[PDB]
C-alpha cells in the first residue's frame, strides 16, 4: 500500500526505496530508527550521501541531486529520502 | 447473524471485528460498555487508536485510516468501528 | 436550547459546537448529514481531525485529544463531537 | 521559547538558527513554507547548501558536514537545519 506523492528517481530505485522502507517498517518502530536504516542502506548501494525523514506531520524544503528524490507514503507514515552531494 | 453494510478493511480483520463484537454482546448489556470492549481489544491486537459506536438510532460522519473501517449489523444493534489516530 | 452532558473543551469552543449544531439542525434533517456539517465546520475552524455522532439511541467509546471533546443534547438529538487523529 | 535537543555547530550559528526561525513563524503558517523561508536565508548567511525540516511529529537520520547540525524545538514545532 505505497503511494508515491512526489518522485524524481528511477523506477527501479523507486521500487528499491519502497522495498527498503517496507523492511525498515517490519523491524523498527521509532521514526529515527526507521530513517537510519534507510539512509544507511541507500548510502552503500548508491553512493553517499543520503538523508531520510520519517514522520506523519512535517514540511520540508531541501536541495537534492537530480534523479535522487522520492517522497512517498507507506500506510499512514510519510518517507522523505533524497541525496544532496 | 452479522450483516456487514460497508467495509474498508481486511476480511481477516472483518471476521475478527464480528467475533469480538459477539463476545461483547454476550458479556455486556449497555451499548457504551459493548463499544468499550471492542475498542480496547482492538487497541491491543491492532495498534491504537480505535473508536466504536453501538446503537439502534444514530448517524455518524467520521474520518478513518485506510483499510481500518467497518460498519455492520450484529443482533439488533449497528456497530461502527474504525481507527483514527 | 442545549444541555451539555459532558465536555472537555473550551467554554468558547463549547459554544461554537452548540452554535454550529443549531445551524446543522436548521439546514439538515438526517442525522448523517447533520454530523457531516459539524465535522466539516470543525475541520475548518479547528484543525483536523474531528468526528461527530448524531442520534437518539447509541453508545460510544472513543479516544480524543484532551480539550477536544463535547457531548450534549440539542433538540431531540444527542450530539457527540471529539477530535482524534 | 527555544530548547535545542542536540547540536553540533557554533554558538552564533546556534543563535542565528533561532532568530530566522522565530521570524519565519510570524510570517508563515504552513510547515513547508516555514522551511523554505528559513533554508533560503541560511544559504545566504552561510553559503549553500542547507536543508530544513519543519514539523511536530517526525524522525530523521541525516548526514551533515561536521560543525553544521542542529535539531531544536520552537513552541510546539521542531526545526531541523543542517548543511550538506
Amino acid at each position: 500500500k505505497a503511494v508515491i506523492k512526489n518522485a524524481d528517481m528511477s523506477e527501479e530505485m523507486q521500487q528499491d526505496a519502497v522495498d527498503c522502507a517496507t523492511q525498515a517498517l517490519e523491524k523498527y518502530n521509532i521514526e529515527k530508527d526507521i530513517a537510519a536504516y534507510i539512509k544507511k542502506e541507500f548510502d552503500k548501494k548508491y553512493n553517499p550521501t543520503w538523508h531520510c525523514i520519517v514522520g506523519r506531520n512535517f514540511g520540508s524544503y531541501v536541495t537534492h541531486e537530480t534523479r535522487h528524490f522520492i517522497y512517498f507514503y507507506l500506510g499512514q507514515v510519510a518517507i522523505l529520502l533524497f541525496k544532496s552531494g | 447473524k452479522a450483516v456487514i453494510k460497508n467495509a474498508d478493511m481486511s476480511e481477516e480483520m472483518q471476521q475478527d471485528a464480528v467475533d469480538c463484537a459477539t463476545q461483547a454482546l454476550e458479556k455486556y448489556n449497555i451499548e457504551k460498555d459493548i463499544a468499550a470492549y471492542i475498542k480496547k481489544e482492538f487497541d491491543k491486537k491492532y495498534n491504537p487508536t480505535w473508536h466504536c459506536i453501538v446503537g439502534r438510532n444514530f448517524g455518524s460522519y467520521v474520518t478513518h485510516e485506510t483499510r481500518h473501517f467497518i460498519y455492520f449489523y450484529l443482533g439488533q444493534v449497528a456497530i461502527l468501528l474504525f481507527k483514527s489516530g | 436550547k442545549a444541555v451539555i452532558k459532558n465536555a472537555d473543551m473550551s467554554e468558547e469552543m463549547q459554544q461554537d459546537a452548540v452554535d454550529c449544531a443549531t445551524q446543522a439542525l436548521e439546514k439538515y434533517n438526517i442525522e448523517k448529514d447533520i454530523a457531516a456539517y459539524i465535522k466539516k465546520e470543525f475541520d475548518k475552524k479547528y484543525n483536523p481531525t474531528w468526528h461527530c455522532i448524531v442520534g437518539r439511541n447509541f453508545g460510544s467509546y472513543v479516544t480524543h485529544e484532551t480539550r477536544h471533546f463535547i457531548y450534549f443534547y440539542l433538540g431531540q438529538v444527542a450530539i457527540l463531537l471529539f477530535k482524534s487523529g | 521559547k527555544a530548547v535545542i535537543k542536540n547540536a553540533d555547530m557554533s554558538e552564533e550559528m546556534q543563535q542565528d538558527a533561532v532568530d530566522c526561525a522565530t521570524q519565519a513563524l510570524e510570517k508563515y503558517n504552513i510547515e513547508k513554507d516555514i522551511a523554505a523561508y528559513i533554508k533560503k536565508e541560511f544559504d545566504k548567511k552561510y553559503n549553500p547548501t542547507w536543508h530544513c525540516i519543519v514539523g511536530r511529529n517526525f524522525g530523521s537520520y541525516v548526514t551533515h558536514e561536521t560543525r553544521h547540525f542542529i535539531y531544536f524545538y520552537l513552541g510546539q514545532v521542531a526545526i531541523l537545519l543542517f548543511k550538506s
Binding site: 524524481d8 512535517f58 514540511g59 537530480t66 533524497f82 | 474520518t63 | 442525522e31 448523517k32 | 523554505a36
Partner: peptide, 25 residues
C-alpha cells in the same frame, strides 16, 4: 556536471485517510 534541484514536501493527513458517513435505517 551534476544537476541539483530544490524540492518541497508537506504532509497531508488525507492521503492515508477516508471520510465515511453512516445512517441507521
Amino acid at each position: 556536471s551534476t544537476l541539483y534541484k530544490n524540492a518541497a514536501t508537506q504532509t497531508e493527513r488525507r492521503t492515508a485517510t477516508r471520510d465515511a458517513g453512516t445512517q441507521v435505517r
